[PDB]
């Protein structure tokens, strides 16, 4: 939900690191034209852990949101954006006709269709060089077949289903030898006392009965193992509740 959305030719990298993704308000916002997610599933996205997350923003027509796929080329998929074949993420696109598509025309929205070669995957090429679509050189001036690489969408509220403004938010999840920094693991049930119960604190598991706080833990401590190498004093990770096992 970003006003003045980033267009397709100048998609901004919004790298997410040292944050905890939720993957819930993403799905519960706006009627999505296409919630396709190749490589990874959005249902298990909250359970999967990734090292780094990139987010990119496109504004393209409804006939152009299907072009965003690995191994696919077109008006947008060859010169505006390219996808690496090891992509793990989603290709979520909106149907934003109310926010964009001014009656005077959203001529600020354009797309690139001139390039001397195919776009490299995960590469941005923002240039204002006059494209030599013909044989004669341009030399700055628009010669015989020298034109700007940009073409206007002219978004207005008279267009069709496949030609309305379409806001595409694509998420890229990358994992490597570094530890995962973006996850969604926030889930914690309420606790009980004086009951034979299995417990799982911060990954470490066990069973037994519980007792409230009585000892003198340090300002920083979480583990209260005794001489007998047995877990007997633990802290609640969400609220400062010292327990005895």
């Amino acid at each position: 939900n970003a006003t003045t959305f980033a267009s397709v030719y100048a998609w901004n990298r919004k790298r997410i690191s040292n944050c905890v993704a939720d993957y819930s308000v993403i799905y519960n916002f706006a009627p999505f034209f296409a919630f396709k997610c190749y490589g990874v599933s959005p249902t298990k996205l909250n359970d999967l852990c990734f090292t780094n997350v990139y987010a990119d923003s496109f504004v393209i027509r409804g006939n152009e949101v299907s072009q965003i796929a690995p191994g696919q080329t077109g008006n947008i998929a060859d010169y505006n954006y390219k996808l690496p074949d090891d992509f793990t993420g989603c290709v979520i696109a909106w149907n934003s006709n109310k926010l964009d598509s001014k009656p005077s025309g959203n001529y600020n929205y354009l797309y690139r269709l001139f390039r001397k070669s195919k776009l490299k995957p995960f590469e941005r090429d923002i240039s204002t060089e006059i494209y030599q679509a013909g044989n004669k050189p341009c030399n700055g001036v628009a010669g015989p077949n020298c034109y700007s690489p940009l073409q206007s969408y002219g978004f207005r509220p008279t267009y069709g289903v496949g030609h309305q403004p379409y806001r595409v938010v694509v998420l890229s999840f990358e994992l490597l030898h570094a530890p995962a920094t973006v996850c969604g693991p926030k889930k914690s049930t309420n606790l009980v006392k004086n009951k034979c119960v299995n417990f799982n604190f911060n990954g470490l598991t066990g069973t037994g009965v519980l007792t409230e706080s009585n000892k003198k833990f340090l300002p920083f401590q979480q583990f209260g193992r005794d001489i007998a190498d047995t877990t007997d004093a633990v802290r609640d990770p969400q609220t400062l509740e010292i327990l005895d096992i």
Partner: antibody
Amino acid sequence: EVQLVESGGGLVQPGGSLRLSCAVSGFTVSRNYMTWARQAPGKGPEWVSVIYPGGSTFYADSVKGRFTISRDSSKNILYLQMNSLRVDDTAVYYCARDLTIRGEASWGQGTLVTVSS
Amino acid sequence: EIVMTQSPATLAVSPGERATLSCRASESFNSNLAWYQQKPGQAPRLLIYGASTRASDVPARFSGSGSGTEFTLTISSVQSEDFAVYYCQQYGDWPLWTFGQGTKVEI
């Protein structure tokens, strides 16, 4: 000016193969979209195949899987190889540099491609 | 894809008179319609692109109007050279477009 000269057309039996050349004078075929347009004697024209400078080639619904569109940048010649021809492929073939978004257009003279047995 | 109909298909206007043609689309595109002129035995020549602007070395008589699923092409004064065939190409998904069927204008 832009001049497009089509050659290689003629009478070819259905189920055979043919190759058409399109000499282009005015620009480079590796930097322009070349449309290989058809026109019926009774009906109007249609789009059949398109090509991109990056190597992206597209075909129509009734012509896909049979045709090959190629470019010669040194010779500046657009080539079209057609295989498994049918009776419906008897038309007049043009090389079309439509480019109608900006507002300049150039169309070739074309050749009468006749497919019959 | 989007197809079109041309009304009327039996157009016949005398020389030196205003001429009217209408194109009705099947679906809605991004207001990208091209009026093309083809003479008998000739390559088609573009007149109007986007249904609002004339082409290079094209006289000011031809004018386009309308947006959406109905478009109107108006010729101010046909003088012995504009009697030809007109197509309303729909380049809303350009370069994937569709040309017309035939609008032979008779004297």
